[PDB]
Design an enzyme around this catalytic site. Structure first.
Site, PDB file in Angstrom:
ATOM      1  N   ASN B   9      82.264  58.827  50.547  1.00  0.00           N
ATOM      2  CA  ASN B   9      81.177  58.544  49.614  1.00  0.00           C
ATOM      3  C   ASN B   9      79.852  58.748  50.331  1.00  0.00           C
ATOM      4  OD1 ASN B   9      80.436  57.332  46.852  1.00  0.00           O
ATOM      5  ND2 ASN B   9      79.239  56.053  48.257  1.00  0.00           N
ATOM      6  N   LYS B  44      72.417  56.374  49.733  1.00  0.00           N
ATOM      7  CA  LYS B  44      72.833  55.842  48.446  1.00  0.00           C
ATOM      8  C   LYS B  44      71.554  55.272  47.819  1.00  0.00           C
ATOM      9  CE  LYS B  44      76.139  56.440  47.621  1.00  0.00           C
ATOM     10  NZ  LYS B  44      76.628  57.773  47.174  1.00  0.00           N
ATOM     11  N   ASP B 226      81.733  51.877  46.954  1.00  0.00           N
ATOM     12  CA  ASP B 226      82.850  52.290  46.104  1.00  0.00           C
ATOM     13  C   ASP B 226      84.153  52.166  46.891  1.00  0.00           C
ATOM     14  OD1 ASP B 226      81.419  53.192  43.709  1.00  0.00           O
ATOM     15  OD2 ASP B 226      80.655  54.802  44.996  1.00  0.00           O
TER      16      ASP B 226
END
Lengths: 258, 257, 256, 257
Positions: B9, B44, B226
Site C-alpha cells: 500500500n 498517504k 489497510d
C-alpha cells in the site's frame, strides 16, 4: 452438478410455452451434466402498472406447466403469491419460488415449506445477505429440506440494481445459492433493463461460485409481455450454458469451502 | 499480456519494499505472459485520522522506487496528490496513478498526462461508470497516450463499498480497465474483509478486464495502512495462477467493444 | 447569529460579481440578525468536461473578491484546490472552503488551518456523518479555531444525491453545521431547482448553524451549475422563511 | 386538517391497546384541529425471525380495535397481508394500511380498494417516489377514492434506511402524503435510532405533508416489536405541539403542486 433454471418469464400462451419447453429439452439432452428446471409464472402479481400483462390464472397455468412436464420430462418451478396457492401449485411444481418482495412473508414461506416440495426464495432488493439466514430458518421450521436462495440484485439508488457478489459466499453458509441473471440487470420502474450485461455477470457468478443459474428466455424477446428488455433469445442459451460449464470447470478448484 | 499491479500500500520500510519487490520479480519470471508493475505509495495523503501512517517523503519514496526498479528491473507506478508532484515522480514511475478522491481534479490529471508517462485513474467511489469517459477525454486533451481506468468499488451506503461489475465493459469503451482487488473489499472507516478479495478477483477476470491491482505484505497484521485488506505475500502466486487459468477460459466470451 | 453564505458559484466576471454583492448587501441590511458571507469560486477545478468553464485564475479571482469586500463591506469566502493557494487566498477570504472531493486531503486541510482563517469543509459525497469527526480533529491539529461542516448530499446510486438529515445533529457534536441548499439537489454527471427551497426549510427545522446557497441574476445564462442557482430576486423571500421557521423550531432543537 | 396516525405497533393485548387509546383520545380533545386515527397491527406478518411476536389473530385484533373505536370514538386503521383479510378488517378500519413490502401486490391493493374504505400505502423501500403513481392508479382502478402514500424510508446500503424528503412534494401530485416518523429511522435487520425521530418529523412538516404516522407504547423497552423506535406515550403531546407550530409558520411556503 450445476442447476439451470430456464423458461419464459410469464405463461403468455401454451403454444409459446411448449416451444420454449422444446429448447430446454434439447438442451438437457446436450448437457447431461446439468440439472435443468423449467420455470414460468402463472401470474405477475406485482406488475407496476394495472395495464400490464398478469396471466391466465392459476388453473390454466398449472395445466400448462403440467403439459410441459408431461411432454418433455422436465421438472417444474413456478412462483406463488398468497398462502392458499401453495398446495395447488405443489401438484406440479418441483420447486416453489417465493417472490423477492415476499421473501419476508412468513405464512407464504411456511405454506410452501409445508407442501414437501423444494423452495427457492428470491432475495429481496432490500435484504442484506446475512439477513437471509432467518429466511432459511423459517423454511426449515416449516418442513422444508431442499432450500435455495437466489441472488437477484440489491436496490442501488432509484430505478437501479447492483449485484453485490459478496452475497454468494455468505449465503452458501445456509443454503444452495442461485444467481438470477435476468432480473439482476433489470432497471425497476425504468419506464414508469440492459440485456448486454446478462452474460458478463453470469460469468462472474460462476467464477465466484454458486450452485445454479436462473435465466429467462423467449422466442421473440421484444414481443414478450413481461421483462422484455431482459429475456434472452432462445438461440443464445446454448452458448451461455457452455461458457458456464467451462468457467465452472476451471474455477470450481478455487471455490471456498463451506 | 495481462497486467498485474502489485506491491505494498505504502512505502513503510525499504527493506520490506525490496522483499516484496523480489517476490514480484520471481513471479514475473514464472509468468512471462504477464506484465508486472510495482505499486506503492510514497505518501498517504488521504488517511482519515491524523495519527495514521503517511510516509517518509516524496524524496525517500522516489528513491526507494528507483532502488527496486534497478535492483529488479520492474516497471514502477505510484500516485500523485497535487499538480506539482507530477514531473518529479514521472522520473521513476512508468504509470502515474491518480487517486480515487482526485479523479475529477482537472489539473492533477492534465499534469500527469504531460509527463508523457502512462496514467491510471482510480475511479471515484462517487463516480458512475459512464462518467469516466470525460476523465479519459481530459487526459487525451492533455497528451496522455496509455490510459487506464481502475474499478475500486462504489459508495454503497455508509462505511461500505460495492463492486458493480457492469462498470468493466462500460469503461472498456474508452480505456483499458484495471480491477483493484483490495480497495474494493475495503470498508471505509469501518476496514475491509480479506475473505472476499480472491472471489471478486475471479469475478473480474471472468467478466473481463485488462489487469488487476493487488496489494501484498509479508504479514498483513503488521501493515501500517489497510492492514485488514493487504494480501499475504505468499498467497500472491496462487492467485496469479488462478486468474490466468480463469482468464484463458473466460476470454473466449469477452464481449467485443 | 445565523450564517448565510451566498453569492455566485463561479466568478464569471467582476461586473456580475458586483451586481450580486449589491443584493447580498441589501439583504445584509434588512436582516441585521443574520451574518451574511459572500462566496464564489475563482476556479472550478473539478468540472466534468474539459470543455467547461473554470474561471479567470486566482489572479482575477481574489481581485474581484477583495473589490466586493471593500465596496460592500461583506465578509468573503472561497475554495482552494491545492495547498499553495492557502496563504495567498487567505488575504481576502474570512472563511477558507475545502471542496467535497478533497475533504480528506490532509495537506489541503493543514495548509488552510495554518492561515489562521475560518475553515468550512464540504462533506464528501462518499463520507459518513460520523467520519467527519476526524476531519475536525485534523483542523484542530492544524491550528483551526473556527470550523464548519457543510452538508451537501450523499452518493445515492449513480448520478444522484440524497440528503440524510440525520447528519445535522450528528456533525453538530464537533463543529458548527452548514447546509448546502444548491449542491444537495444536484445530479452528478444536472439538477432540480424545485427542491432547493423545500429542503432548506427541512434543514432549519432540524437545526443548523447556517445555510449555504448560490444565486445568479440570470440562472439560465450561468456558466456553472445553471440548474441549481436561485434567481437573485428570490433570496430575500427564502431568507425571511428561514428566520421564521428558525424562530418556531429553535425551541425544539436538541442539545449536544 | 392535519392527520396524525398513532397507536402501538402491534396489538400486544387489549388492555395495553385501550391504555394507548385513552391517551390518543385525550390528544384528539386537546388538539381539535388535528384528525387522529388510531393504529395498531393485529399481525406482524413480515418479522425477520420465526421466533418473534406476530399477534393474537385477526378476530382478536378486530375486536380490540373495535373496542377502542366504540369506547373512545376514534377512527381506526390497521394493515392487511392477504386479500381475504380486507373485507373482515373493513368492518372496523377507517383506513386499510398496505405494508411496504406488499405495495406492488396488485390483488391486495385491489382487495382493499374494493372494501370502500380509504387506503394508505406504505411506500416500499425499493420504490422511487415517481413509481408511486402506478400505485395510486391501481387503487383508483379498484374503487379507492381516498388514497394515501406514506414515506417510510428507502434502502440505503445494508441494514439502513434514508429518508429522501424530495419524495413528499413528488408524491403529493397523486395522493395525500403521510410521513412515517417511526419506521424511517429504523435499522432493518440491524439487531433503529430513537433520537432521530423528532428531528425528522420537524423536517417533514417543514417540507410539507398531509400527516405524520408515529407508533407509541407506554413502556417502549417492553414492546414486542419495533421496541427501539416506539415513542414513550408521554412524549406524543410535545411532538404534536411542535408539529402544529412548525406547520403553522411553514405552511404558507408549501409549493402549489
Amino acid at each position: 452438478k450445476f442447476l439451470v433454471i430456464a423458461g419464459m418469464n410469464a405463461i403468455e400462451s401454451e403454444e409459446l410455452l411448449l416451444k420454449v419447453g422444446e429448447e430446454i429439452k434439447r438442451l438437457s439432452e446436450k448437457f447431461k451434466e446439468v440439472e435443468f428446471v423449467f420455470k414460468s409464472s402463472f401470474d405477475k402479481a406485482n406488475r407496476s402498472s394495472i395495464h400490464s400483462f398478469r396471466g391466465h390464472g392459476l388453473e390454466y397455468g398449472v395445466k400448462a406447466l403440467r403439459k410441459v412436464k408431461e411432454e418433455f420430462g422436465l421438472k417444474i418451478t413456478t412462483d406463488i403469491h398468497e398462502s392458499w396457492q401453495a398446495e395447488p401449485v405443489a401438484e406440479v411444481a418441483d420447486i416453489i419460488q417465493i417472490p423477492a418482495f415476499l421473501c419476508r412473508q412468513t405464512d407464504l414461506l411456511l405454506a410452501a415449506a409445508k407442501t414437501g416440495r423444494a423452495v427457492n426464495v428470491k432475495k429481496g432488493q432490500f435484504l442484506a445477505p446475512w439477513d437471509t439466514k432467518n429466511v432459511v430458518e423459517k423454511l426449515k421450521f416449516g418442513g422444508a429440506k431442499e432450500i435455495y436462495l437466489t441472488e437477484r440484485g440489491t436496490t442501488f439508488g432509484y430505478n437501479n440494481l447492483v449485484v453485490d457478489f459478496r452475497s454468494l459466499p455468505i449465503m452458501k453458509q445456509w443454503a444452495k445459492v442461485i444467481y438470477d441473471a435476468t432480473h439482476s440487470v433489470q432497471l425497476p420502474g425504468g419506464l414508469g433493463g440492459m440485456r448486454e450485461f446478462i452474460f458478463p455477470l453470469i460469468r462472474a457468478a460462476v467464477a465466484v461460485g454458486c450452485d445454479g443459474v436462473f435465466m429467462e428466455t423467449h422466442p421473440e424477446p421484444e414481443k414478450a409481455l413481461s421483462d422484455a428488455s431482459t429475456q434472452l433469445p432462445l438461440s443464445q442459451l446454448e452458448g451461455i450454458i457452455e461458457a458456464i460449464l467451462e468457467i465452472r470447470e476451471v474455477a470450481s478448484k478455487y471455490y471456498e469451502t463451506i
